[PDB]
CSV table of C-alpha atoms in Angstrom, one decimal:
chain,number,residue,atom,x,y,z
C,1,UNK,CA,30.0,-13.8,-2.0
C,2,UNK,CA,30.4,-15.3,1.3
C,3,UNK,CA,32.9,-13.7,4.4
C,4,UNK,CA,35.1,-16.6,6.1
C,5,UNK,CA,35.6,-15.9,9.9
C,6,UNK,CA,37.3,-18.6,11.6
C,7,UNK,CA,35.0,-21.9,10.3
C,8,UNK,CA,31.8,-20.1,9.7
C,9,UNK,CA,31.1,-18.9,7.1
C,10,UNK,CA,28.9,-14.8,6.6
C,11,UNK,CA,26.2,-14.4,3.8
C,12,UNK,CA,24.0,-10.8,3.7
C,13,UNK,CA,20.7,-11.6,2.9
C,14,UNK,CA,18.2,-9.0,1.7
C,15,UNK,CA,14.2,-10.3,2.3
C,16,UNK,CA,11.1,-8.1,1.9
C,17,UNK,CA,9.3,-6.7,4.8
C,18,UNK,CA,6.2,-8.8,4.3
C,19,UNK,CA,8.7,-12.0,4.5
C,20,UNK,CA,10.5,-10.4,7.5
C,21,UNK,CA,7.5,-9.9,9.1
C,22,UNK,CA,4.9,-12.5,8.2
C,23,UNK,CA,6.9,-15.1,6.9
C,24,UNK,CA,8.1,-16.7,3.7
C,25,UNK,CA,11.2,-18.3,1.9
C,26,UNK,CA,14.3,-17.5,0.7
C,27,UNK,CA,17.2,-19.2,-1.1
C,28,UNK,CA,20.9,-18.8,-1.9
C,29,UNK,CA,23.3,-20.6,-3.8
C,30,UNK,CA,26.3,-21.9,-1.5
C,31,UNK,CA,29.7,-21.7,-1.7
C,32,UNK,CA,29.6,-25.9,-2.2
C,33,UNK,CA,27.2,-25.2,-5.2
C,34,UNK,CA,24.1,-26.6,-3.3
C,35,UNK,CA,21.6,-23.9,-3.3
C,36,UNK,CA,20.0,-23.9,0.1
C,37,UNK,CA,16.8,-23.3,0.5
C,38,UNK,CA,14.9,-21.2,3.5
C,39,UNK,CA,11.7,-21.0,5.4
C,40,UNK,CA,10.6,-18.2,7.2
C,41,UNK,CA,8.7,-19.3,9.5
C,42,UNK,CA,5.0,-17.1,9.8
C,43,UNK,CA,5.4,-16.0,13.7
C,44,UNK,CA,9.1,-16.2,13.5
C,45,UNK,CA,9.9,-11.9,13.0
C,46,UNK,CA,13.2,-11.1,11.1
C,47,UNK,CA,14.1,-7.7,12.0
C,48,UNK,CA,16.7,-5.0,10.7
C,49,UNK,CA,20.6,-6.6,11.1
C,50,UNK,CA,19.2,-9.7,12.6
C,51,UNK,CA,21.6,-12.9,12.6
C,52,UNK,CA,20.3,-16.3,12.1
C,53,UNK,CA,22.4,-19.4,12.1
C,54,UNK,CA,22.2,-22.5,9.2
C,55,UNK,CA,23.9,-25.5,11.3
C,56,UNK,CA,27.1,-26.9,9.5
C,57,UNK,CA,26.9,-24.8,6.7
C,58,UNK,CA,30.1,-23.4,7.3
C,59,UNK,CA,33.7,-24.7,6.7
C,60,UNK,CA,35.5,-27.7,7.6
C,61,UNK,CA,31.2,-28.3,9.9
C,62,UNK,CA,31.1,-24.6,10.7
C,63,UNK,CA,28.1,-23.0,10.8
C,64,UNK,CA,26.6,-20.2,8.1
C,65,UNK,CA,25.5,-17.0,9.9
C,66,UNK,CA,22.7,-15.1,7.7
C,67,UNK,CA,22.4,-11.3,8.1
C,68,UNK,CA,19.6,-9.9,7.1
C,69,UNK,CA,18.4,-6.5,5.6
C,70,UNK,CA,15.3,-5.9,5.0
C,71,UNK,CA,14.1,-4.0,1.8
C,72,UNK,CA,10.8,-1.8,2.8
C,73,UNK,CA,8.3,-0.5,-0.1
C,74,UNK,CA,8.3,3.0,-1.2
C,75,UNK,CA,6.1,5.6,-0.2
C,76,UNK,CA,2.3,5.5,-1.2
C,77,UNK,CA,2.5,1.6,-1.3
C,78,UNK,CA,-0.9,1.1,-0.4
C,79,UNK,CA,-4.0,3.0,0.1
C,80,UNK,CA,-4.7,5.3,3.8
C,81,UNK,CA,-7.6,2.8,4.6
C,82,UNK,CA,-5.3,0.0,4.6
C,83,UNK,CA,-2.8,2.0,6.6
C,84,UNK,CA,-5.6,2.2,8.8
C,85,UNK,CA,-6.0,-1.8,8.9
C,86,UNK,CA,-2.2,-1.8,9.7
C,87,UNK,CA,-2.6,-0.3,13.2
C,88,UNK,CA,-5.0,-3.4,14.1
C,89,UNK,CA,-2.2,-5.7,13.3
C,90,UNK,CA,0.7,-4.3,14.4
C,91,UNK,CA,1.3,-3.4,18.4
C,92,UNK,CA,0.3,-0.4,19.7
C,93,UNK,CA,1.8,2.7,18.7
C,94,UNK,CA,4.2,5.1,20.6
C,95,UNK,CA,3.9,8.5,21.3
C,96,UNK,CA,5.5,11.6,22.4
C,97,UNK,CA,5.0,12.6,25.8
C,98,UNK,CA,6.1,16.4,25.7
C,99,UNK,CA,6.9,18.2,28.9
C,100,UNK,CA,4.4,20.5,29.8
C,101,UNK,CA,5.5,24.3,29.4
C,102,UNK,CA,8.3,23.6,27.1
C,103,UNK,CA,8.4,25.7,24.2
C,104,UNK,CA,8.0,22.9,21.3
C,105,UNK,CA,8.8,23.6,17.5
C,106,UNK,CA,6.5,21.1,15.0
C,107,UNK,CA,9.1,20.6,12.7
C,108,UNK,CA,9.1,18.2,9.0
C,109,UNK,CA,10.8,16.3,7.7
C,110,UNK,CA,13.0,16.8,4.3
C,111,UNK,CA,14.7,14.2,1.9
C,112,UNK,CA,18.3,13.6,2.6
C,113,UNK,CA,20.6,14.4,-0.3
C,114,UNK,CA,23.3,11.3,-0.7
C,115,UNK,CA,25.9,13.8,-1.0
W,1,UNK,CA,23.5,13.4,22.7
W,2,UNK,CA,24.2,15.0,19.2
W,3,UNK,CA,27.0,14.3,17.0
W,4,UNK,CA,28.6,17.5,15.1
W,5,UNK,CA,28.7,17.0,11.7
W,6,UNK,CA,30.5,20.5,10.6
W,7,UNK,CA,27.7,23.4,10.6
W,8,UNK,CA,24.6,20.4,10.8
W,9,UNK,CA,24.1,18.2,13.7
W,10,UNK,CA,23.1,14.2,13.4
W,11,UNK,CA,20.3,12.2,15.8
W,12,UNK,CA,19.8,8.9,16.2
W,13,UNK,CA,16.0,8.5,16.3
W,14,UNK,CA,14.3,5.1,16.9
W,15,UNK,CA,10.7,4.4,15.9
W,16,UNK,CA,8.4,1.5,15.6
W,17,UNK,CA,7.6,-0.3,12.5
W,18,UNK,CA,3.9,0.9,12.7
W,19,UNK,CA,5.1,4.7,12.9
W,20,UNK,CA,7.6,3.5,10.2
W,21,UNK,CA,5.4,2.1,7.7
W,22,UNK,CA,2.3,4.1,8.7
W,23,UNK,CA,2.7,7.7,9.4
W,24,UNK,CA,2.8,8.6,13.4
W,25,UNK,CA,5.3,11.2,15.1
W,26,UNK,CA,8.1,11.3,17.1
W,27,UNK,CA,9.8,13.9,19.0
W,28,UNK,CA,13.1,14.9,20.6
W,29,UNK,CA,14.8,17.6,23.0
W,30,UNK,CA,17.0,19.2,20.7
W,31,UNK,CA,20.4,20.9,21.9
W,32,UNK,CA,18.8,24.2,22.5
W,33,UNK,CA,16.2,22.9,25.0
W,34,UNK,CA,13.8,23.4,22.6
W,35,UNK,CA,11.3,20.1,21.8
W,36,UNK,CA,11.2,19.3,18.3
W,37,UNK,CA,7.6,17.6,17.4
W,38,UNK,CA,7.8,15.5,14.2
W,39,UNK,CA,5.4,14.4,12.1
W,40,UNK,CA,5.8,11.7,9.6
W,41,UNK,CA,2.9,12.1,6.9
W,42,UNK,CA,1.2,8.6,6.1
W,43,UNK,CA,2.4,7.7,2.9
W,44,UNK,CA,6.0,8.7,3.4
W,45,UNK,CA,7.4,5.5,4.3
W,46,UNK,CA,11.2,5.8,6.9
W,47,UNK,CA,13.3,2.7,6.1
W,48,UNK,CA,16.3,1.3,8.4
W,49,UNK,CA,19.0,3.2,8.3
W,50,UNK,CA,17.3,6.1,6.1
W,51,UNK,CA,18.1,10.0,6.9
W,52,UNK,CA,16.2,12.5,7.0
W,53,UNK,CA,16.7,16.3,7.0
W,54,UNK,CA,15.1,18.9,9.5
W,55,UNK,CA,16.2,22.5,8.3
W,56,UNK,CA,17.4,24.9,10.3
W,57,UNK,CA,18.1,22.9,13.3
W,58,UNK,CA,22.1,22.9,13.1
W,59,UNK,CA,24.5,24.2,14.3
W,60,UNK,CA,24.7,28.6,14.1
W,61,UNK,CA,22.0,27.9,11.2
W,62,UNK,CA,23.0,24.2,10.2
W,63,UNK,CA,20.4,21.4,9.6
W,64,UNK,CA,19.5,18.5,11.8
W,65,UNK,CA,19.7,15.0,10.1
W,66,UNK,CA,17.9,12.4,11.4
W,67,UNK,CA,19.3,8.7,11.1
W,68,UNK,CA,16.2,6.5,11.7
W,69,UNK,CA,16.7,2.8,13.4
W,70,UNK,CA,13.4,0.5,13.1
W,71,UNK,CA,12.0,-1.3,16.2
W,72,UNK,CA,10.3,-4.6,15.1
W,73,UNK,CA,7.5,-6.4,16.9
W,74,UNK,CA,9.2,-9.4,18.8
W,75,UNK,CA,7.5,-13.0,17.6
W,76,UNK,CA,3.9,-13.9,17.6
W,77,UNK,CA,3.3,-10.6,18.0
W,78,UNK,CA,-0.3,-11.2,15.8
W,79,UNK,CA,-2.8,-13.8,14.9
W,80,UNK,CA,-2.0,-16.2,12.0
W,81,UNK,CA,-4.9,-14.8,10.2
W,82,UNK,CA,-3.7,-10.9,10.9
W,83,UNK,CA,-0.3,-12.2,9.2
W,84,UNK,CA,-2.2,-13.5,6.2
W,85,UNK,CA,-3.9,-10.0,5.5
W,86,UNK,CA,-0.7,-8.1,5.9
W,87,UNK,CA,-0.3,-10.3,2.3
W,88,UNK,CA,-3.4,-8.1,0.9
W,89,UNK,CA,-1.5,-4.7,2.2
W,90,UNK,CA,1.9,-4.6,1.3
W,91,UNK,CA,3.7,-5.3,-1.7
W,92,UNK,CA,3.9,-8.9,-3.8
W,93,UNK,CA,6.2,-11.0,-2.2
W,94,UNK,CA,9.0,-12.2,-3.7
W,95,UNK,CA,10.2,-15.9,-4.0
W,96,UNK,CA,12.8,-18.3,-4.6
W,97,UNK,CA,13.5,-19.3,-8.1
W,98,UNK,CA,16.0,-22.5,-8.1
W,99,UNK,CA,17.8,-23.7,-11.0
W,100,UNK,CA,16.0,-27.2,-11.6
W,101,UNK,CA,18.1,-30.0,-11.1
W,102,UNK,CA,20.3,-28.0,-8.7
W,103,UNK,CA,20.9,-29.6,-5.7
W,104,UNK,CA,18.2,-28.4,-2.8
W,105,UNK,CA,19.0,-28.5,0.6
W,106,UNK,CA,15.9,-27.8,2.8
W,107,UNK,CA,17.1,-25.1,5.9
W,108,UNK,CA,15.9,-24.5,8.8
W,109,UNK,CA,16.9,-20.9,10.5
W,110,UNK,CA,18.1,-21.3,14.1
W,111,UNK,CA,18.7,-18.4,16.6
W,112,UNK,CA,22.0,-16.4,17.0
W,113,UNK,CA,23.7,-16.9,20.4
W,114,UNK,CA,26.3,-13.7,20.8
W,115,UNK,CA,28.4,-15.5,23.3
């Protein structure tokens, strides 16, 4: 389903993280029937909530404004060495810088129950 | 700041996809002046958006939930090549599958001006 603001036209997308961040395609059918189809370009990083726009895709031409969300694998996806390799593509990481002589409390982290 | 959900208190945390994906840690001055150190176990993947629970860190106690926002690398953030072996770490991709004889329009994704 597609959201109608003014004469553009809304459409949530949900990619893959390797597609969000290393490129890829996409496709969706459109409101016309046409079923546009998308490339991600490799360099070209979609990130959580991003907006893209699809020129005159919209309605008498609007534009369609894509909205993505990005769907990440589950836990033990891979194996540690390549979580290793990871940190060699990826930026560098951050960490936390603590104040000296506070009194810190290493804490873990528990599943959320949905309700 | 914290927001006071009844008897637990919520955080807005942000980490980078590497931490995200990869195991790292995090940490955070929590209302009693205490530093709360967090690890996040390689394996145990955070998603956008995803909540986490910290027991015992409520309100008088309560349990601190964590709500975790993603940072992504901006574009060309790697080589070409390092892009192509993030294909040999995560996940199968996942393609388009158009109805043949559908009518195709090719799309290009242009940037989102807020203004």
């Amino acid at each position: 389903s597609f959201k109608r603001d003014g004469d553009d036209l809304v459409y949530e997308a949900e990619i893959d993280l390797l597609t969000a961040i290393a490129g890829g395609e996409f496709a969706l059918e459109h409101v016309s029937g046409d079923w546009l189809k998308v490339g991600i370009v490799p360099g070209e990083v979609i990130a959580p909530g991003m907006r893209k726009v699809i020129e005159g895709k919209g309605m008498p031409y609007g534009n369609l404004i894509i909205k993505f969300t990005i769907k990440f694998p589950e836990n033990h996806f891979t194996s540690e060495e390549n979580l290793k390799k990871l940190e060699e593509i990826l930026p560098p990481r951050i960490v936390p810088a603590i104040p000296k002589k506070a009194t810190v409390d290493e804490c873990v982290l528990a599943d959320f129950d949905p309700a």
